[PDB]
Amino acid sequence: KNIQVVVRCRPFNHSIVECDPVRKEVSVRTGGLADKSSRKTYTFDMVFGASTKQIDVYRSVVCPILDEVIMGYNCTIFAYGQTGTGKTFTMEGERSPNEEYTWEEDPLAGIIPRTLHQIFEKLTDNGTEFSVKVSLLEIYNEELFDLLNPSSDVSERLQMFDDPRNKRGVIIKGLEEITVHNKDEVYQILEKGAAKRTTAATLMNAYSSRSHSVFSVTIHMKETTLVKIGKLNLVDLAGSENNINQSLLTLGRVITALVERTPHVPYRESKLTRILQDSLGGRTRTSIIATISPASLNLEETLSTLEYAHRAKNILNKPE
Amino acid sequence: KNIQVVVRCRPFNLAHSIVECDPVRKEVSVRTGGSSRKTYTFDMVFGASTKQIDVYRSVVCPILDEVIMGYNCTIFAYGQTGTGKTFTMEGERSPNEEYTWEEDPLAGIIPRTLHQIFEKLTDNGTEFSVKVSLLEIYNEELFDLLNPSSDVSERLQMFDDPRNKRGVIIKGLEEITVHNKDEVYQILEKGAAKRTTAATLMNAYSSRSHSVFSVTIHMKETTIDGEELVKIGKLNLVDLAGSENNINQSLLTLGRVITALVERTPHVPYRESKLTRILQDSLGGRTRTSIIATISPASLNLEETLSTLEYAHRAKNILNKPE
Ligand SMILES: CON(C)C(=O)N1N=C(c2cc(F)ccc2F)S[C@@]1(CCCN)c1ccccc1
Ligand SMILES: CON(C)C(=O)N1N=C(c2cc(F)ccc2F)S[C@@]1(CCCN)c1ccccc1
Ligand SMILES: Nc1ncnc2c1ncn2[C@@H]1O[C@H](COP(=O)(O)OP(=O)(O)O)[C@@H](O)[C@H]1O
Ligand SMILES: Nc1ncnc2c1ncn2[C@@H]1O[C@H](COP(=O)(O)OP(=O)(O)O)[C@@H](O)[C@H]1O
Ligand SMILES: [Mg+2]
Ligand SMILES: [Mg+2]
């Protein structure tokens, strides 16, 4: 199964970006001043334009993937793109101003909170007893951080090792798995993460745009007609305008090596590609959401992102 | 009137305690050893079990009563990073969305203050407007953290006000109007969000910056005889930078000023930094001033807790002459 690549465009806070969902097409005014007429076009698996509310993203991109998680496959969603184009928005979201909605209902919620709420809804009183545990593992300067561990300072780095059993596997020493016992335990658990993020931003320069975040949901399920185990990793990558950059560089070379069928794929050259090894060229169903800004001020980065997302279409995975 | 100096001690985390606070004796005492200790006396002393409403009732309500009479006032939060300065002046949310913002027991001074201004001034005769500014000092550069237009990183300039002489004018600093109690939280949300950018753009912004949150209240009384009496009250809520920290110039200049004021030297170095120049009248001037020292109960912070208590204790001897 080829990696699916979705493009989403944010609204202005004179677009050079035109989206055609039905044609699955993105169009860019490249010539600006002299050449009003030239455009670049790329085709992707799906295309969402600037009026795409969150529920459109959740219904089309996530629900299908999460259903597959509920079967007991692995799945990953990456958000890729230039800083300020909506990666954190898409994977996490925001709160409607002035305490208008509860977190379960807020139309501005994104993938992570929308998922943890519906994991419980999809699986309650339908036979299956199940456990939900989450991890927030984050990479900065090729150093590993736990951002939901409650008895640790964020600044305590983790260690990573080869898993002897697996060969793509890594073991992270002391990565905390927090259990989510019910739907109304989520937001509380997300708030503890929110606060260490703030501490992390205080400890590390440009932490929010220079760090990679892997938010992982593990579901053990019991339905004797049978035990399934599905894992969904929610990856907020660092802005694609970037040791400080090593994971972002190596994600690049892995994707290249994979599609040009190059011999030695360098998963081991960076912690991000070691953790997410099975997501690039493995037994994981992987989706990439490329995010882009509609303003001519960002022409070169928008084009950089589209070229990157498009060359990633050709990676074959084998969800097993 | 001597400046009021209170010490508040935070509780531990989920991650030995060398701090014993005695409210009734208003004494905080710290184990220098472990047969050893140092003791200080303060105007008030709050222990790790002190709820926020106790801080607000004890420390702020008089201050605010005085603001409404038409005086200026400042409340400083001093202490080393991780002891509760931002806890004290802004607060936190009770977990799991349990209370609305107006009712949350974990709200701190600023949100509680903006709530009760409207409460205290409902139907009491006085007509009034509330405007707020969030001005911040970082690396001796000025920042507006509530201007809805303009990016955070757009720096402001400051000048001597020719009219006043302690005065400065800050060019392009925005005053946002709070028309009622239910416009507050929303306005703070814009603040909360520009803060997140600021931390992204500037190294350790949350601990190396000074934050001046100012509420000005224009008041109009009209007597039994028709005449209008106009009072103007201003409250500055100052979250100072961590006392363990050019990048340090305001924090360093505050120290020299406080020293200079308490050993009564003629030359106070107000204009050696933007913080002491902005807040010039709060140190040795006609402003009623309170300092809240924050300290940690852990032996691991022994050296800084002392440095803080010693710092706070010397500010007791600053005399102000309000209005
Ligand atoms: C109010 O405080 N909190 C905790 C939040 O607002 N959120 N929790 C999130 C979150 C935090 C993390 F640390 C890690 C991964 C995450 F998904 S998502 C987010 C949005 C904030 C992100 N900018 C949210 C939750 C629920 C509904 C709508 C938005
Ligand atoms: C995102 O939600 N918001 C906006 C908040 O939670 N708060 N607004 C704060 C705030 C932000 C500023 F930029 C400046 C001065 C301030 F006081 S106070 C605080 C929480 C403190 C840390 N933010 C709060 C509000 C209401 C009840 C209880 C606590
Ligand atoms: N699809 C969208 N709809 C509304 N606002 C958006 C959208 N995408 C991004 N934004 C806004 O743009 C700003 C940048 O979003 P952010 O998620 O921080 O980008 P990134 O994570 O790539 O740095 C935020 O204020 C966010 O509200
Ligand atoms: N009085 C208090 N009660 C409860 N928690 C506190 C208190 N003071 C500090 N904390 C906690 O300690 C940490 C440091 O708080 P903070 O105000 O950010 O410190 P500072 O701004 O002085 O560096 C936060 O987790 C906060 O919740
Ligand atoms: Mg982001
Ligand atoms: Mg702080």
UniProtKB/Swiss-Prot annotation, chain B:
N6-acetyllysine, modified sites: 120
Post-translational modification: A subset of this protein primarily localized at the spindle pole is phosphorylated by NEK6 during mitosis; phosphorylation is required for mitotic function.
Domain Kinesin motor residue range list: 2-318
Compartment(s): Cytoplasm; Cytoplasm, Cytoskeleton, Spindle pole
Taxonomic superkingdom: Eukaryota
List of residues binding ATP: 79-86
Record's disease association: Microcephaly with or without chorioretinopathy, lymphedema, or impaired intellectual development: An autosomal dominant disorder that involves an overlapping but variable spectrum of central nervous system and ocular developmental anomalies. Microcephaly ranges from mild to severe and is often associated with mild to moderate developmental delay and a characteristic facial phenotype with upslanting palpebral fissures, broad nose with rounded tip, long philtrum with thin upper lip, prominent chin, and prominent ears.
Function: Motor protein required for establishing a bipolar spindle and thus contributing to chromosome congression during mitosis. Required in non-mitotic cells for transport of secretory proteins from the Golgi complex to the cell surface.
Membership in a protein family: Belongs to the TRAFAC class myosin-kinesin ATPase superfamily. Kinesin family. BimC subfamily.
Quaternary organization: Interacts with the thyroid hormone receptor in the presence of thyroid hormone. Component of a large chromatin remodeling complex, at least composed of MYSM1, PCAF, RBM10 and KIF11/TRIP5. Interacts (via C-terminus) with the kinase NEK6 in both interphase and mitosis. Interacts with RARRES1 and AGBL2. Interacts with TPX2.
Protein name per UniProt: Kinesin-like protein KIF11
Lineage: Eukaryota, Metazoa, Chordata, Craniata, Vertebrata
Shown stretch of the complete protein: 17 to 364 of 1056
